[PDB]
Design a protein around this ligand. Sequence first.
Ligand code: COA
Lengths: 380, 380
Amino acid sequence: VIKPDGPATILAIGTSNPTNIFEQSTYPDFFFDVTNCNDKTELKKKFQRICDKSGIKKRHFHLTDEILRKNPSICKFKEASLDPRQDIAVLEVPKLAKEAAISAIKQWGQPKSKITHLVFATTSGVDMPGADFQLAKLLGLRPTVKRVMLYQQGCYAGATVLRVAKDLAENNKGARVLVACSEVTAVTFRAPSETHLDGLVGSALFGDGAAALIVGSDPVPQEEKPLFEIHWAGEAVLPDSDGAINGHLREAGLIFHLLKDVPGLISKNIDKVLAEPLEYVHFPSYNDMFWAVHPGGPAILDQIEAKLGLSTDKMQASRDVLASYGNMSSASVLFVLDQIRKNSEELHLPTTGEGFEWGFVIGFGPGLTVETLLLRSINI
Amino acid sequence: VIKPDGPATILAIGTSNPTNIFEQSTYPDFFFDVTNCNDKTELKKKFQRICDKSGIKKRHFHLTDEILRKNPSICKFKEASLDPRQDIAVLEVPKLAKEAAISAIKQWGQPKSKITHLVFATTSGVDMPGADFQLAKLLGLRPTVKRVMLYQQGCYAGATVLRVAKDLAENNKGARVLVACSEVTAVTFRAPSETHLDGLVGSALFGDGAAALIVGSDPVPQEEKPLFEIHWAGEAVLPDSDGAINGHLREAGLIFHLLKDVPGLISKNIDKVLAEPLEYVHFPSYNDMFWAVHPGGPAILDQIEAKLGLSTDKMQASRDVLASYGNMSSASVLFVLDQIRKNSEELHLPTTGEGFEWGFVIGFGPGLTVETLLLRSINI
Ligand SMILES: CC(C)(COP(=O)(O)OP(=O)(O)OC[C@H]1O[C@@H](n2cnc3c(N)ncnc32)[C@H](O)[C@@H]1OP(=O)(O)O)[C@@H](O)C(=O)NCCC(=O)NCCS
């Protein structure tokens, strides 16, 4: 059996976001108005404070005043609302991923018939057949596409899809994996409550977006353009982090429980989490590496930056994504990678990874699970 | 980078089921009593006829008369019931898998510390952290265990976990994958209705169970005992099968809709689906192969048997699993593999695959997706 020789390589990155732009400056005005919570004046000041410090400037949402008016239960706190949230999500998640996938396939330059695998991740509702099937059908991929559907994996899923794609691409000759992460906040949209302060954080951070990539080993020279090589993939459940990030798909929708200790737990353990991939590549200085860190919140980026002694330009690509699109869960880290290669091509840098050789793709979510990938950039 | 040489090998199989046995003969009496539908006499006769022709003799359930009385909403048709269904499923799914995993690890003979990967599949509710995290924690596996959580993939998931485990084991040296499939019917439990005849099928067929396997390449001689080798893994979405098995996770739980003839569609296309792996091994006669077909119902086993001209003993292991435990979704096909292996050992057959060299693991579900794996048995 002939197995491919080279590491799993990202051959194309494409992104998409819904067209309805919501400025973070005035998001509390919209948020408290659609959920009929204008009377909760003290809670609005608290949400304004969180939004002002969120590092987010704008977010793209599928949900509008019109869609929330047509589905009033989504605007209610504890009322049965899973059915209309799912009906929106099940349709929009693969549709958004379709636009991201088309852009990734167009950038790749090869026909869609060469796609042998499909890895899809979403935390925006569940359905049978899954979003993976829906995407495959919408794009017109081969009916024999090998699918890996990753439902409800949260914010580390951007890293999980690349970890899964690594093994699929590297173990199958000629395998070209379509990776897709798509998040639509229809299921997580929570009305503000004085009893759910961690729900205000999620409401200030979560945005919509989709990212798609083509991953494959042994790139065909003068045909495919290698962007990043995946050299190591792994994860870690952080000690004493039980219940730090919980998410339950209830009748009222997807309820997130975020403890305030999340940025601190990641900072305390980030050096230990990065220990194994660092030794694989002979301990390069943190400041000699590129960083595609999931913008879970600004406090996570600020505290990883401070704990590791990183120069302020390292977290810039992550902060730019957070500023322009917010926390798009699984999609976020792939948008960061796209921004890293785009900045590199725009500035005519030595490599696709901001001039640096090695880099990290870090995602975090439920567990607390921190998913890490060691990437090598390509010389340009 | 040193990659392993051999194919992904099943090194141990362990199974588990809840202790409450419900005989199929009198199941309609229990079912119509807990759901308060004793007055629906004509529907009871129709359900009795489905249970009598189901090929199922007994099913193991976590749900009892006691648990259903303490959770009245689960016994209702359209009343909001996802919350108590989830509370039960989220706790019981990894607990059942723990028991199956312990049995698999014990049969393997190596410490649990050597497990580098965990692939979990379930259609019995969703949660963040997933059932994968919960299983890893309950077993005390390394905090760095690489996880693949397969939620809501239905009845093909038993084959998907093996396809995923194939690439993980074959692309990583020393990798030992814990495969786990666990199904508890708390979410699929549907009160009988004259307006949901598709629900009667699921009510007559779905049972509880868990199966766990240890998958790895390059077995260390005189330490590990190879049971089956995975040589090919793939899938296919059957033509003109749109909406054949639709499953929606609603407020009232998991609702199934069967818009097409599932057993008829698989039979018509099975020759075409099996074409690629048969080609890999020079088209051996179907009757010279072992069959680990998912016991979705009696019709699928009967119709594949008739279309492919199989001798009656081929579907026996699948029929024995259906008879003893019903349709345990993802877990079923792995129980069949265990039964094929067990029959082979007790009858002192030449191979672990009932004397035959090559064989198929066929899973089917939403799409209509048919997942197939080509396995080679081990000489004993
Ligand atoms: C939420 C966040 C943007 C707030 O900005 P900040 O720079 O931390 O500013 P502060 O911490 O001083 O203020 C945050 C306010 O929200 C509260 N808050 C922050 N995180 C909270 C949480 N997880 N649960 C409840 N309240 C929280 C703080 O207590 C404070 O409330 P206050 O008005 O009574 O003082 C920041 O803490 C952050 O990014 N946190 C991580 C968010 C996260 O975990 N994201 C991943 C989600 S999967």
